[PDB]
Write a protein that binds this ligand. Structure first.
Ligand SMILES: Cc1cc2nc3c(=O)[nH]c(=O)nc-3n(C[C@H](O)[C@H](O)[C@H](O)COP(=O)(O)O)c2cc1C
Ligand SMILES: Cc1c(-c2ccc(-c3ccccc3)cc2)nc2cnccc2c1C(=O)O
Ligand SMILES: O=C(O)c1cc(=O)[nH]c(=O)[nH]1
Length: 354
């Protein structure tokens, strides 16, 4: 069943379809609940900032950009779902092809360019299931919403504020995405996050989400220091670490390795894990981190948890392994936690800094 997807059904779909087309079909299948069938280990439960997560494996932003398949993503086994990026006004993104497969590297390059249905459409989609989500979140399945700016946009801070106001009420956490491959200084990021956090605080208590920043793996050491400073200063709720990389590590073998765009998957794994490690030390383990980048196995997840991530996201591994990947990562993560003498996931967060 997991062997069937990895060895036969998934390679066949890839052989028959352009990646963006296959992305669209995946979303359709998931939206209709056409999914295969592991559940409910108490070791895997984690309570980040008080909110409780049933397992720590979520679907990264970008797969369900417009909130069309949220329920089917929970049905796949994910412990939380993140949708987006959503831009305020609708925009078409970049011309096609804009998604490229690097199978020799177990990697993807994409330059979607924030194709977004827009805040209004996503709002209605989320409003159509708002009370369903309330009960889901209560039973350990929270929802996150990832916000972008429009490309023709004038005030970037205004775009993120609109997102906070329109979609903040529907979200358990919000993500200010400032790390798309397709900002000036520390004082500029302080001005943006201060506006975002102010709009957030103006929402009613039961509609007041956590606010996380999502950062690139391509930051200089000074950028990471600056983010860490502003994050602790302004009381940002967390970090998502990392987005895709505009770097092109050596030894990438795919023919399409020189396409412009963000590289995801295995070649990002350890670069992503080292940024977690770095951001966790700079914030004294005081800020929750969702680790994302190249994760496709228990060991990939545990390395990021030991590095300081309280939760992990994946995306690219789903395009190779199919929906069975979620069960696989969960099953392995529980086995290695035991093996290594951890009581649960919470016992392991940051365990590498002792
Ligand atoms: C095709 C594609 C589209 C993506 N779109 C977004 C996006 O809209 N917003 C965002 O914050 N990240 C986006 N991402 C990045 C993922 O959220 C994730 O950070 C990145 O792919 C690294 O994870 P992975 O190697 O497990 O896929 C996208 C990634 C891919 C591959
Ligand atoms: C194969 C695939 C998938 C994919 C295809 C099918 C399924 C699936 C979902 C539910 C049931 C059975 C299969 C999931 C993901 N997504 C993608 C998403 N974004 C970019 C690229 C891709 C690709 C790709 O061409 O590399
Ligand atoms: O083009 C996009 O929509 C996009 C791609 C990506 O890799 N990361 C991101 O934040 N946005």
């Amino acid at each position: 069943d997991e062997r069937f997807y990895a060895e036969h059904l998934m390679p066949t779909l890839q052989g028959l379809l352009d990646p963006e087309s296959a992305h669209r079909l995946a979303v359709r299948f998931t939206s209709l609940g056409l999914l295969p069938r592991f559940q409910d280990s108490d070791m895997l439960e984690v309570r980040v900032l008080g909110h409780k997560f049933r397992n720590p494996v979520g679907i990264a932003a970008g797969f369900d950009k417009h909130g069309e398949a949220v329920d089917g993503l929970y049905k796949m086994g994910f412990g939380f779902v993140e949708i987006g990026s959503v831009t305020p006004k609708p925009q078409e993104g970049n011309p096609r092809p804009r998604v490229f497969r690097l199978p020799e590297d177990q990697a993807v390059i994409n330059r979607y360019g924030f194709n977004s249905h827009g805040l209004s459409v996503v709002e209605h989609r989320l409003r159509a299931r708002q009370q369903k989500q309330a009960k889901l979140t209560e039973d350990g399945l929270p929802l996150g919403v990832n916000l972008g700016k429009n490309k023709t946009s004038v005030d970037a801070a205004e775009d993120y504020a609109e997102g906070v106001r329109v979609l903040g009420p529907l979200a358990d956490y919000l993500v200010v995405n400032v790390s798309s491959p397709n900002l000036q200084g520390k004082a500029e990021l302080r001005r943006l996050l201060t506006k975002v956090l102010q709009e957030r605080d103006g929402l009613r208590r039961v509609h007041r989400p956590a606010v996380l920043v999502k950062i690139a793996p391509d930051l200089t050491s000074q950028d990471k220091e600056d983010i860490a400073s502003v994050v602790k200063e302004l009381g940002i709720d967390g970090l998502i670490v990392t987005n895709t990389t505009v770097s092109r590590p050596a030894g990438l073998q795919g023919a399409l390795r020189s396409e412009t765009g963000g590289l995801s998957g295995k070649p990002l794994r350890d670069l992503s894990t080292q940024t977690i490690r770095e951001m966790y030390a700079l914030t004294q383990g005081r800020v929750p981190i969702i680790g994302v980048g190249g994760v496709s196995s228990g060991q990939d997840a545990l390395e990021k948890i030991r590095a300081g991530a309280s939760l992990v996201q994946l995306y690219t591994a789903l395009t190779f392994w199919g929906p069975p990947v979620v069960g696989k990562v969960k099953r392995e993560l529980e086995a290695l936690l035991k093996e290594q003498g951890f009581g649960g996931v919470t016992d392991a967060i940051g365990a590498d800094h002792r």
